[model samples]
Target chain A: GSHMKISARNVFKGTVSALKEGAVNAEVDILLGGGDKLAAVVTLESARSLQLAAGKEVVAVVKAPWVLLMTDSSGYRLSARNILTGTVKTIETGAVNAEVTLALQGGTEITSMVTKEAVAELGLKPGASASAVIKASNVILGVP
Target chain B: GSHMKISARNVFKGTVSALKEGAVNAEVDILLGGGDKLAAVVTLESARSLQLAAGKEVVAVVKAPWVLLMTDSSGYRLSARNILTGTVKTIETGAVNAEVTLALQGGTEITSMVTKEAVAELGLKPGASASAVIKASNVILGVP
Candidate 1:
């Protein structure tokens, strides 16, 4: 249920709702939250350039590849990465791969996949960190 | 010696120049020797955008990866990828790469490199494709 039309250049100036310290090159910033809250983790340089104000409108760019979808039982954090939240409602395992379902609001859903090895490592379950990374170039528009 | 100053917007414009037919991604135009005869090898897209006229006053943006230098040998047809030419005087070889030196008239010595693998794969000898891919971003302007 996250469909918003934005501009091409102003995506970097979105208002920041929250910010937390990181372990390494990782930091967390809470942006516009849809169903619950949408958190984006990015580099310090990226954060600085966008001049990520606390109340300014910003675009969230998402291109394919760079917009990665993953499922982990992690908290709201984006460490050198952007991870949006979702709910896992279904799971389908295949011969060589497995696809997990993440339900968003508005009866919409996005899929994040995992290998058997990853599944074992994470022990992923419902309410996991079903997050997606929007491409830096994709999120280029932001308007209030 | 490549020198030209450009802003971020100019980088996007210069990228439009790398689309010549017989070119690769990230290729660019460059001047050879100290004369008017110049050449450019670019991707198909760049060729169309600039509508590059044969003798247009186009700038050649050269950077590190694209600058090639050779010494001693001769008899080589300047290919489309070959954008510039110079004298091969300085020769330095690293563990995995060999750099030929060409003293250019532009108060700078042009140097290009061929990896050991490239030398073996292309069967490249001294003084072959002594060209430079001058990118607009890398071309910084100097005080004249």
Candidate 2:
């Protein structure tokens, strides 16, 4: 009856490139700027599930064992759990899907792959908004 | 299509009153000693999509790894994640689908069982719900 929440507690930082640049999946992280405004590749499957676009807001849920939490953030709320947030920086459109970027509030950013129809519904654009939320349940208690 | 949320973090601790008590594709969970009490049980065509109960409750999306946790008390907080509260305490007669017990915090109890009919409807019971082999993931971790 209901969809389950995606967990974005642990994701490895990667680059942003275009689908032509080899990014696939509606669920992906794209890099930009540092190298000719590249968009991270996303998959076609995820593109259909979340609907991808150039300016749409899509969250990259990473439930891995590599997430790190700094003990302090002068302006960040540690109690808030997931800290990544961003705005639409760039998009690379395709025949059936598109790629979008999200720059976190702490300056960290991620990209996602989604579908064209979904992108239209999400109203994604060059200035659209999105955030990466994490459930505390997804945050496993561990020491590194 | 948009996704919806059905958040009822409740864990019912009842008993196994009736087993798979069906002929083809229908089964039921009778209340333990709760005179003629019945809860219709049917299996979804696929495990990925399921309609849990009558009240829009998220079907207990259990897998081979998720454990089924029950306690003898219902004084837990609402904010807790994955705490099911219900009593399972009856066993009804059915073709290969006898009931099981799930006792909750108080004297409350309920029943569930594997039935030949349910097995056919869901196309699973015989494959997974048989033998009462409790998987560990069903062993949920609680903080109450």
DockQ (C-alpha based) per candidate is 0.02, 0.03
TM-score of candidate 1 to 2 decimals: 0.28
What would you estimate as the lDDT of candidate 1? 0.40
Q: Provide the TM-score for each candidate, comma-separated.
A: 0.28, 0.25
Q: How many residue pairs clash in each candidate?
A: 26, 87
Cα-based RMSD of the predictions, in order?
19.2, 20.1
Model 2, range B1-144, lDDT digits (tens) per residue? 122111111123223243342332223243323232233333221111332222232212121112233332345443223343443343333434433344444343323334435434533321132122232122211111
> What DockQ would you assign to candidate 2?
0.03
Query: Could you tell me the lDDT of residue A67 within candidate 1?
Result: 38
iRMS per model in Å: 22.9, 20.1
Error of 1 at B86 (Å): 38
Per residue, candidate 2 scores C-alpha lDDT tens digits across A1-144 of 253344543343334232221233222334423221222223455455444444443333344211221111222222112334457677676554345566655455555544333356556666666543332223222111
Encode model 1's per-residue lDDT on B18-42: one tens digit a residue: 2224332223343333432333444
CA shift at A21, candidate 1, in angstroms?
13
